[PDB]
Amino acid sequence: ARPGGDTIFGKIIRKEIPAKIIFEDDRCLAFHDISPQAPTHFLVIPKKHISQISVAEDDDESLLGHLMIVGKKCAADLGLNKGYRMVVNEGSDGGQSVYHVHLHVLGGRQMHWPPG
Amino acid sequence: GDTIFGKIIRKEIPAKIIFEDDRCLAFHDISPQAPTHFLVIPKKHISQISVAEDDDESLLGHLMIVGKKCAADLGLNKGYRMVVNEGSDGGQSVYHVHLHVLGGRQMHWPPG
Numbered sequence: 001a002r003p004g005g006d007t008i009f010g011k012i013i014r015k016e017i018p019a020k021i022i023f024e025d026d027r028c029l030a031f032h033d034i035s036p037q038a039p040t041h042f043l044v045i046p047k048k049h050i051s052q053i054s055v056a057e058d059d060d061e062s063l064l065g066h067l068m069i070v071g072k073k074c075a076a077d078l079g080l081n082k083g084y085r086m087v088v089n090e091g092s093d094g095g096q097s098v099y100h101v102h103l104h105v106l107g108g109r110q111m112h113w114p115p116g
Numbered sequence: 117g118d119t120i121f122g123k124i125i126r127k128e129i130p131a132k133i134i135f136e137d138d139r140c141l142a143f144h145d146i147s148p149q150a151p152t153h154f155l156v157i158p159k160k161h162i163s164q165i166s167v168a169e170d171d172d173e174s175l176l177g178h179l180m181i182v183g184k185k186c187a188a189d190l191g192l193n194k195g196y197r198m199v200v201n202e203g204s205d206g207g208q209s210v211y212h213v214h215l216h217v218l219g220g221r222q223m224h225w226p227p228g
């Protein structure tokens with residue numbers, strides 16, 4: 001059990017697969033999405049492996065909130081001064097493709113409603 | 117300034133409440149975009165995620181944990197999408213921080 005696991009995102013955490021990194025600390029990593037859906041589109045992920053939000057534990061609250069605080073700070077650092085949308089996809093109906101928790105941050109254009 | 121979400125927290129206008137604790141409130145969205153569409157909001161008036169403080173971390177994480185628990189209780193066993201909107205480009209509709217939780221249909225990509 002390599003730390004962070006062997007999903008795409010676990011490999012990125014251990015520098016085994018390349019990524020365009022915006023910010024890194026002891027708890028999380030922010031990097032650009034390889035298939036962007038907006039002019040700016042990045043991901044914020046914990047270093048701790050949690051497969052999906054539906055299985056997060058109560059004591060994971062601080063870490064999940066940290067993803068949002070880092071996401072909003074990275075958005076400011078990238079000049080997203082008109083705003084942005086944060087997204088978590090859970091399971092099949094959420095469209096989830098990578099089973100390591102992650103927060104999308106999208107901006108640099110007008111986002112539409114409904115959010116998919 | 118006050119918002120309609122402040123009025124909902126204070127019980128001044130009605131909403132279909134799903135869950136409440138000492139620090140947040142979850143309730144069905146009045147303009148639902150999926151068969152299940154609810155909001156989880158802090159009782160603290162944070163106007164937008166861009167002005168949240170570092171010491172709000174665990175409160176924000178609490179919104180997500182409450183959101184995922186309410187989703188399971190509402191029977192969203194095939195999954196769901198969580199969304200926080202910021203500002204004009206994000207489509208933020210009320211200037212009181214709120215986590216959307218949507219499910220009961222396939223959610224699509226891009227997410228708006």
Ligand SMILES: Nc1ncnc2c1ncn2[C@@H]1O[C@H](COP(=O)(O)O)[C@@H](O)[C@H]1O
Binds near residue numbers: 019033034096098
């Ligand atoms: N190697 C990679 N580097 C950066 N982003 C990725 C990589 N592989 C997948 N993604 C993105 O990860 C997200 C996974 O889908 P989802 O689980 O629905 O959020 C998608 O937006 C992908 O484009």
